[PDB]
Structure formats: C-alpha cells, structure tokens
Amino acid sequence: QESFKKQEKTPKTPKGPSSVEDIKAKMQASIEKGGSLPKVEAKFINYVKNCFRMTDQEAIQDLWQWRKSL
C-alpha cells in the first residue's frame, strides 16, 4: 500500500442509511450546512419526524440522549 497525497479531490462526504444512522448523518448536515440543530426535546422530536421515518419511542429517547451527549 502506497501514498501520493497530492490532491485526492475536495471533502464533502454525503451520507443517509436505512435506520437511526441517517438521523445522525442528517444532524451533522443541519449543524454544518444550516449551522444549527434543535436544542429542546419537543422541537427536536418534530425535526426528527420531519427528517426520518421514525416510530420507535425507545429509539427516539436513545437518540435524544445521543444528541445531548455532543
């Protein structure tokens, strides 16, 4: 394995999986491209159900704790 490290194009890295890892990738897109992400639970839940096919309340609170762990 070998290096050349002269250009390797520009960074951008688009991401969107089948499950809560899409929510995590789209949280990065909001806090980078939009600069901001919601900081209070009921507005953040509105945003999560706007950004994904979210239905599992146990995964919603697991994700809210993961978003507060930032």
Tab-separated table of N, CA and C in Angstrom:
chain	number	residue	atom	x	y	z
A	1	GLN	N	0.846	-1.213	0.000
A	1	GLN	CA	0.000	0.000	0.000
A	1	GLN	C	0.871	1.250	0.000
A	2	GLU	N	0.425	2.337	-0.634
A	2	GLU	CA	1.293	3.453	-1.046
A	2	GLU	C	0.592	4.830	-1.049
A	3	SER	N	1.385	5.897	-0.901
A	3	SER	CA	0.943	7.298	-0.828
A	3	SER	C	1.394	8.158	-2.023
A	4	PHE	N	0.596	9.187	-2.316
A	4	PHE	CA	0.870	10.230	-3.316
A	4	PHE	C	0.317	11.590	-2.875
A	5	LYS	N	-0.875	11.590	-2.258
A	5	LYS	CA	-1.366	12.616	-1.330
A	5	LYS	C	-1.257	14.059	-1.855
A	6	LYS	N	-1.509	14.227	-3.160
A	6	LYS	CA	-1.250	15.474	-3.903
A	6	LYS	C	-2.501	16.317	-4.143
A	7	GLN	N	-3.664	15.669	-4.238
A	7	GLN	CA	-4.968	16.309	-4.440
A	7	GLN	C	-6.083	15.530	-3.718
A	8	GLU	N	-6.343	14.273	-4.107
A	8	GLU	CA	-7.427	13.409	-3.585
A	8	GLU	C	-8.803	14.115	-3.516
A	9	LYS	N	-9.113	14.951	-4.524
A	9	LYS	CA	-10.279	15.860	-4.613
A	9	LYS	C	-10.540	16.700	-3.341
A	10	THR	N	-11.726	17.296	-3.224
A	10	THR	CA	-12.155	18.089	-2.057
A	10	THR	C	-13.052	17.278	-1.108
A	11	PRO	N	-13.063	17.559	0.210
A	11	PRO	CA	-14.013	16.939	1.137
A	11	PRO	C	-15.473	17.338	0.858
A	12	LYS	N	-16.419	16.407	1.049
A	12	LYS	CA	-17.872	16.690	1.109
A	12	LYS	C	-18.654	15.605	1.861
A	13	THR	N	-18.379	14.330	1.568
A	13	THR	CA	-18.872	13.099	2.226
A	13	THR	C	-20.399	13.061	2.505
A	14	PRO	N	-21.247	12.823	1.481
A	14	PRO	CA	-22.696	12.642	1.651
A	14	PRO	C	-23.041	11.281	2.288
A	15	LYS	N	-24.021	11.252	3.204
A	15	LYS	CA	-24.463	10.060	3.964
A	15	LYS	C	-25.970	10.084	4.283
A	16	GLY	N	-26.637	8.929	4.184
A	16	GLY	CA	-28.049	8.695	4.538
A	16	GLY	C	-28.470	7.201	4.524
A	17	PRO	N	-28.207	6.411	5.589
A	17	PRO	CA	-28.615	4.992	5.724
A	17	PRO	C	-30.131	4.667	5.807
A	18	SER	N	-30.468	3.426	6.192
A	18	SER	CA	-31.846	2.900	6.325
A	18	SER	C	-32.502	3.131	7.702
A	19	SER	N	-31.713	3.434	8.737
A	19	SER	CA	-32.110	3.494	10.159
A	19	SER	C	-31.581	4.770	10.851
A	20	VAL	N	-31.497	4.803	12.187
A	20	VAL	CA	-31.117	5.986	13.002
A	20	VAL	C	-29.734	6.574	12.638
A	21	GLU	N	-28.840	5.809	12.007
A	21	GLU	CA	-27.597	6.353	11.435
A	21	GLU	C	-27.829	7.417	10.336
A	22	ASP	N	-28.967	7.398	9.621
A	22	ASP	CA	-29.416	8.506	8.755
A	22	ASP	C	-29.702	9.754	9.585
A	23	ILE	N	-30.454	9.626	10.684
A	23	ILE	CA	-30.720	10.749	11.592
A	23	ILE	C	-29.412	11.385	12.062
A	24	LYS	N	-28.424	10.574	12.455
A	24	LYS	CA	-27.117	11.061	12.918
A	24	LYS	C	-26.324	11.793	11.819
A	25	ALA	N	-26.330	11.257	10.596
A	25	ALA	CA	-25.720	11.896	9.427
A	25	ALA	C	-26.413	13.226	9.064
A	26	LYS	N	-27.747	13.263	9.137
A	26	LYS	CA	-28.575	14.437	8.829
A	26	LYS	C	-28.491	15.500	9.933
A	27	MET	N	-28.290	15.103	11.195
A	27	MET	CA	-27.882	16.007	12.281
A	27	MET	C	-26.557	16.711	11.955
A	28	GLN	N	-25.543	15.982	11.448
A	28	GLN	CA	-24.292	16.637	11.020
A	28	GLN	C	-24.546	17.624	9.868
A	29	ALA	N	-25.354	17.236	8.875
A	29	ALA	CA	-25.703	18.119	7.763
A	29	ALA	C	-26.416	19.403	8.239
A	30	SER	N	-27.361	19.318	9.182
A	30	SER	CA	-28.028	20.503	9.745
A	30	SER	C	-27.060	21.422	10.503
A	31	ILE	N	-26.189	20.879	11.366
A	31	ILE	CA	-25.266	21.691	12.189
A	31	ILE	C	-24.036	22.219	11.416
A	32	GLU	N	-23.760	21.694	10.218
A	32	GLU	CA	-22.743	22.212	9.290
A	32	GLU	C	-23.358	23.147	8.230
A	33	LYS	N	-24.295	22.650	7.409
A	33	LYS	CA	-24.872	23.373	6.259
A	33	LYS	C	-25.866	24.449	6.688
A	34	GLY	N	-26.726	24.143	7.662
A	34	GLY	CA	-27.646	25.095	8.298
A	34	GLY	C	-27.049	25.836	9.501
A	35	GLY	N	-25.929	25.350	10.046
A	35	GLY	CA	-25.231	25.905	11.213
A	35	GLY	C	-25.847	25.568	12.583
A	36	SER	N	-27.092	25.077	12.607
A	36	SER	CA	-27.906	24.885	13.816
A	36	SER	C	-28.703	23.577	13.789
A	37	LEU	N	-28.995	23.065	14.987
A	37	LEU	CA	-29.774	21.851	15.256
A	37	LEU	C	-30.625	22.072	16.528
A	38	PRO	N	-31.889	21.597	16.626
A	38	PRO	CA	-32.752	21.950	17.757
A	38	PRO	C	-32.206	21.466	19.105
A	39	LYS	N	-32.446	22.247	20.163
A	39	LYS	CA	-31.825	22.096	21.498
A	39	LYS	C	-32.808	21.811	22.642
A	40	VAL	N	-34.097	21.660	22.325
A	40	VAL	CA	-35.195	21.381	23.267
A	40	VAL	C	-36.067	20.225	22.754
A	41	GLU	N	-36.505	19.324	23.644
A	41	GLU	CA	-36.921	17.967	23.238
A	41	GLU	C	-38.100	17.927	22.251
A	42	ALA	N	-39.168	18.702	22.471
A	42	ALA	CA	-40.383	18.587	21.657
A	42	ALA	C	-40.203	19.127	20.223
A	43	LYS	N	-39.381	20.177	20.068
A	43	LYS	CA	-38.973	20.729	18.765
A	43	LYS	C	-38.006	19.800	18.046
A	44	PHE	N	-37.068	19.206	18.783
A	44	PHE	CA	-36.164	18.209	18.225
A	44	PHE	C	-36.922	16.952	17.744
A	45	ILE	N	-37.954	16.499	18.469
A	45	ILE	CA	-38.850	15.399	18.055
A	45	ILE	C	-39.645	15.764	16.786
A	46	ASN	N	-40.169	16.996	16.677
A	46	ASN	CA	-40.769	17.491	15.426
A	46	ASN	C	-39.779	17.405	14.244
A	47	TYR	N	-38.538	17.858	14.451
A	47	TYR	CA	-37.459	17.823	13.458
A	47	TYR	C	-37.092	16.381	13.063
A	48	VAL	N	-36.934	15.462	14.023
A	48	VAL	CA	-36.647	14.036	13.769
A	48	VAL	C	-37.742	13.387	12.918
A	49	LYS	N	-39.022	13.617	13.238
A	49	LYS	CA	-40.142	13.090	12.433
A	49	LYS	C	-40.330	13.819	11.092
A	50	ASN	N	-39.717	14.988	10.908
A	50	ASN	CA	-39.576	15.664	9.612
A	50	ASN	C	-38.430	15.068	8.761
A	51	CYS	N	-37.321	14.658	9.389
A	51	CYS	CA	-36.098	14.178	8.733
A	51	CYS	C	-36.041	12.656	8.478
A	52	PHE	N	-36.895	11.848	9.120
A	52	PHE	CA	-36.844	10.382	9.034
A	52	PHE	C	-38.203	9.696	9.291
A	53	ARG	N	-38.326	8.428	8.876
A	53	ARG	CA	-39.449	7.508	9.160
A	53	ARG	C	-39.436	6.954	10.599
A	54	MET	N	-39.341	7.843	11.590
A	54	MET	CA	-39.153	7.477	12.999
A	54	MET	C	-40.467	7.046	13.675
A	55	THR	N	-40.463	5.896	14.360
A	55	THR	CA	-41.649	5.314	15.031
A	55	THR	C	-41.369	4.710	16.418
A	56	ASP	N	-40.129	4.309	16.710
A	56	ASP	CA	-39.755	3.633	17.959
A	56	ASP	C	-39.414	4.648	19.066
A	57	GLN	N	-40.283	4.796	20.072
A	57	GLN	CA	-40.116	5.795	21.143
A	57	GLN	C	-38.856	5.544	21.996
A	58	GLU	N	-38.541	4.278	22.262
A	58	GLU	CA	-37.266	3.843	22.848
A	58	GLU	C	-36.026	4.275	22.034
A	59	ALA	N	-36.077	4.243	20.696
A	59	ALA	CA	-35.003	4.768	19.843
A	59	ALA	C	-34.975	6.304	19.811
A	60	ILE	N	-36.135	6.974	19.893
A	60	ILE	CA	-36.256	8.440	19.983
A	60	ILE	C	-35.545	8.969	21.231
A	61	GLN	N	-35.814	8.404	22.409
A	61	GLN	CA	-35.144	8.833	23.643
A	61	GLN	C	-33.667	8.395	23.696
A	62	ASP	N	-33.311	7.243	23.109
A	62	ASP	CA	-31.908	6.823	22.952
A	62	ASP	C	-31.109	7.790	22.052
A	63	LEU	N	-31.759	8.314	21.005
A	63	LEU	CA	-31.208	9.293	20.069
A	63	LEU	C	-31.154	10.698	20.693
A	64	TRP	N	-32.170	11.118	21.455
A	64	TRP	CA	-32.159	12.392	22.196
A	64	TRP	C	-30.991	12.454	23.186
A	65	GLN	N	-30.776	11.384	23.959
A	65	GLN	CA	-29.601	11.249	24.824
A	65	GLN	C	-28.291	11.268	24.016
A	66	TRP	N	-28.214	10.576	22.872
A	66	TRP	CA	-27.035	10.621	21.988
A	66	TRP	C	-26.764	12.032	21.415
A	67	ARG	N	-27.810	12.812	21.102
A	67	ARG	CA	-27.729	14.213	20.640
A	67	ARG	C	-27.402	15.208	21.759
A	68	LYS	N	-27.742	14.901	23.014
A	68	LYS	CA	-27.339	15.677	24.202
A	68	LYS	C	-25.906	15.337	24.658
A	69	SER	N	-25.409	14.154	24.283
A	69	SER	CA	-24.038	13.661	24.509
A	69	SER	C	-23.026	14.161	23.452
A	70	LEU	N	-23.042	15.455	23.104
A	70	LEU	CA	-22.328	16.031	21.941
A	70	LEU	C	-21.137	16.917	22.343
